[PDB]
Amino acid sequence: MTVKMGFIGFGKSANRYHLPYVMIRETLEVKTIFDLHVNEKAAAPFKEKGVNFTADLNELLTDPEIELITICTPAHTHYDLAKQAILAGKSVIVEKPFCDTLEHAEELFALGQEKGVVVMPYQNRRFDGDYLAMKQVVEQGFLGEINEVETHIDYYRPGSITEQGPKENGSFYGLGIHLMDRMIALFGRPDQVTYDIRNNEVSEAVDNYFDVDLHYGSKLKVKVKTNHSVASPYPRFIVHGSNGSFIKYGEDQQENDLKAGIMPDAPGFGEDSPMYYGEVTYRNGNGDWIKKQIKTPVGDYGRYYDAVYETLKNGAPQLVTKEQALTNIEILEAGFLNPSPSVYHLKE
Amino acid sequence: MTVKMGFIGFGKSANRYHLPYVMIRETLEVKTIFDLHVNEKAAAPFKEKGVNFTADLNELLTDPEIELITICTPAHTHYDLAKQAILAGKSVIVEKPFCDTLEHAEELFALGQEKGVVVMPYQNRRFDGDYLAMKQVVEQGFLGEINEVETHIDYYRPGSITEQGPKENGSFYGLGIHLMDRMIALFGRPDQVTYDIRNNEVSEAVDNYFDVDLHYGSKLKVKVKTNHSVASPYPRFIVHGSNGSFIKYGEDQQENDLKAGIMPDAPGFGEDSPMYYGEVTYRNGNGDWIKKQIKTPVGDYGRYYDAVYETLKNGAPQLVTKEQALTNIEILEAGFLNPSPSVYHLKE
């Protein structure tokens, strides 16, 4: 009735998006934390909670009572840790990037099948309020046939990205990944994708801009977009269909609050501002026009571990499907095979 | 003195976009109007003012006092008629489509350069209030280095465009020509263009949708777009630079005014609603953020004719250049050279 879990990494990543949520859930249980160079004052409060720390990896992998493991270490270690963990007979969560290659990403899934364990990336952004509100409108079907969805993550940080680097250090890889995952999880695998990826400030630096479109037939297209020189925000989400529209400004504040010492168990944590409630405008069957706000659903990233709990305890379908993980990674990688702008048809 | 002009055609285009404006200017004199099947009902108020009509093209072309001529008849005629007016020694204004092909178009600018007379397409939308409010801002240089501009023309007319026809009959050809033209006139010739042209209802019916990106180097990109199923409007214009943004909602009302029986001499014609003034949000060199509204320049399509006057009576530069006109037609046609989405590379 409780999942015995551990952590491969005690960095800030594991400390800002994982533990503040995991600790508040009586359905979860954190036994061992694994950092090669752990921190005492940060861990001090955790050890006092009964949490066990160690820089001995096998002390965590051989531990027979543990079944789940999250990897929150540097991007380059994610493939081999997930490999080492699957073998130890445990289910694992992998922060981005899942794997260095699509072929490796597939490898792990074949092993999830083999060792009969769960393997998937950490996609917490599926529990963003603004995305959730968009997802709810699309599922009830008010708008009719959806022809287009636009989703952003802009900043006003001109001149922040100025250096060279591998595509893995870019924004498409850093941000697009999240944006496409939740849309791929909603509309499925597209037929083709078009890419405009670049640095609109320093030509030769890693991308800080991208305008990518995932097409579905001739009727629909979902556009994910990022720009670092945006002073006037576009809506966080734009949706258009045959019966109407949905416009949603304002992003999920879980991140801006956690950065201010406000934890997940705190009251009000994850509730959007009514001044930011999404807005629907459609004409019913009677041809009448209707305009109301959509109360943004409460955003909670922990629900990602809630999902893992139902999967591990109630066999409920695993949140991230191999197909969404693999499709996402194929588009990410495909965006760098050709010089932008480019077009690309999914493997079929 | 004033410029003596005539009209090749007396249809609805003439009686709505040209005549209402030309009659109010004293620098202009409509001496002759030509048409195979004139309308005595509508010719009365004109004939009475001093305008002569005729069903004989020679009379109009042979007249040596007429220096300017406007072609408003059906599209398929525009080529040979304009060529006839160039030979007859007159300057000509041609409603879109200027010509049936790029090859032909170039020939006209040539013949025009030959006989020594101005030749150019009537591009009135360069005088739309919101386009002007955007142009004014880009020229003053508030926002520093502009990295993107998004210009629209949407409608909520689902289920209207349902049939096949030549490309000239689609949205990109009837609406994209106006959006792009005024952007080419401002930023010049792009390096490449990407196309997403289609119909999101009946894939094979003439296109009722388009997302076209005009690329300028690695820093700037102008996106022209249209969609017939948009209930919640996008901004009419969107601009982002190094120093700030400019968002402009609301379109020019000169048409809904003319289509409402309000003439160009009516009080407050072409004046934008204060609730629609575009708004800038930029930061000066002191780091100070400034957010103010921009009074929309008054909309007046008659200004196209004022420009033509400064070119004919004062030797001023002509509004629509051979480059602007020809490039617009190159990109328009180049979009249907291959299946969408596609990427295109310009010359020169």
DSSP per-residue letters across B278-325? EEEEEE-TTS-EEEEEEPPPPP-TTHHHHHHHHHHTT-PPPSS-HHHH
Q: How many CB pairs under 8 A join A and B?
A: 101
CATH number for domain A123-348, candidates 1.10.3720.10, 3.40.50.300, 3.30.360.10, 3.20.20.140: 3.30.360.10
Q: What is the largest CA-CA distance in chain A?
A: 67
Closest CA relative to residue B82, chosen from B62, B66, B68? B68
What does the alpha-carbon distance between residue A199 and residue A172 come to, in Å, rounded to a whole number? 11
Which of A110, A109, A64, A127 lies closest to A90, judged by CA? A64
Quote the radius of gyration of chain A (alpha carbons, Å): 21
CA distance A331 to chain B (A): 16
Buried b (16+ CB within 10 A) or exposed e, A118-155: bbbbbbbbbbbbbbbbbbbbbeeebbeebbbbbbbbbb
Tokens of B31: 């001496």
* Residues of chain A contacting residue B229, judged by C-beta atoms under 8 Å apart: 147, 240-242
Q: Say how far apart CA A299 and CA A129 lie, in whole Å.
A: 4
Number of C-beta neighbours around residue A93 at 10 A: 26
The answer to whether A2-122 and A123-348 have equal CATH topology is no
The distance in angstroms from the start CA to the end CA of chain A is: 41
| Expt. technique | X-ray
CATH for B2-122, among 3.30.70.890, 3.40.50.300, 2.60.40.1230, 3.40.50.720?
3.40.50.720
Structure tokens at B125: 């939308």
Quote the minimal CA–CA distance from B109 to chain A in Å.
Answer: 33
Inspect the interface and report whether the beta carbons of B247 and A238 lie closer than 8 Å. Answer: no
| Contacts of B338 by beta carbon, 8 Å cutoff, 6+ apart | none
* Tokens of residue B104, six digits: 């032909």
Rounded CA-CA distance B57/A174 in Å is 66
Please indicate whether, in this complex, the C-beta atoms of B203 and A219 are within 8 angstroms of each other. yes
Give the Cα separation of B240 and B221 in Å (integer).
Answer: 10
Taking CB atoms and an 8 Å cutoff, what residues of chain B touch A279? 232
What is the spatial distance between Cα B249 and Cα A283, in angstroms, rounded to a whole number? Answer: 22
Q: Which of B203, B230, B283 sits opposite A218 (nearest CB)?
A: B203
The residue among A116, A123, A126, A56 whose CA lies nearest residue A96 is: A123
Q: Are B221 and A240 a contacting pair at CB < 8 A?
A: no
| Cβ neighbours of B283 in A, within 8 Å | 231
Indicate yes or no: CB of B148 within 8 angstroms of CB of A282.
no
Calculate the CA A201 to chain-centre distance.
27
Q: Please report, for residues B106, B191, B211, B328, B334, the alpha-carbon distance to residue B346 in angstroms, rounded to integers and kept in the order given.
A: 16, 5, 18, 11, 9
What letter represents residue A331's amino acid? I
CA A56 to chain centre: 29
Give the resolution in Å. Answer: 2.3
- Do the beta carbons of residue A186 and residue A162 sit within 8 Å? no
B234's tokens:
């996008």
Other beta carbons within 10 angstroms of residue B337's beta carbon come to 9
The domain spans of chain A are: 2-122, 123-348
Distance between CA atoms of B291 and B289, rounded to whole angstroms?
Answer: 7
Work out the number of other CB atoms within 10 angstroms of the CB of residue A14.
Answer: 21
Contact across the interface for A240 and B218, Cβ inside 8 Å: no
Q: Do A341 and B342 touch (CB under 8 A)?
A: no
Contact A281 B196 (CB under 8 A): no
* Six-digit token string for A179: 């944006």
A219 CB neighbours in chain B (<8 A) are 200-201, 203
CA distance B244 to A158: 10
CB B72 within 8 A of CB B9: yes
For A272, counting Cβ atoms within 10 Å of its Cβ (0-12 exposed, 13-18 middle, 19+ buried), the class is buried
Residues A76 and A63: beta-carbon distance below 8 Å: no
The answer to whether the CB of B177 falls within 8 A of the CB of B212 is no
Is B231 close to A218, i.e. CB distance below 8 A? no
Q: CA B156, CA B231: separation in Å to the nearest integer? A: 5
Which residues sit opposite A343 in a β-bridge?
A194
**Other CB atoms within 10 A of residue B137 CB:** 22
Q: Which helix (H) or strand (E) holds B224?
A: strand B220-227
Query: Three-state SS across A172-227?
Result: HHHHHHHHHHHHHHHHCCCCEEEECEECCCCCCCCCCEEEEEEEECCCEEEEEEEC
Strands B68-71 and B52-54: unpaired
Region of A268 on the Ramachandran plot (φ > 0 left; ψ -120 to 50 alpha; else beta)? left
Mutation to test the A interface, candidates B171, B199, B343, most A Cβ within 10 Å = B343
| DSSP per position, B53-113 | EES-HHHHHH-SS--EEEE-S-GGGHHHHHHHHHHTT-EEEEPSPS-SSHHHHHHHHHHHH
Q: Is A6 helix (H, G, I), strand (E, B) or coil?
A: strand
For chain B, first and last CA: distance in Å? 40
Distance CA A188, CA A129 (A): 21
Q: Are B307 and B319 in contact (CB under 8 A)?
A: yes
**Chain-chain contact of A194 with B198 (C-beta, under 8 angstroms):** no
Q: What angle is formed at CA B337 by the lines to CA B229 and CA B325, rounded to 5 degrees?
A: 80
Contact A321, A118 (CB under 8 A): no
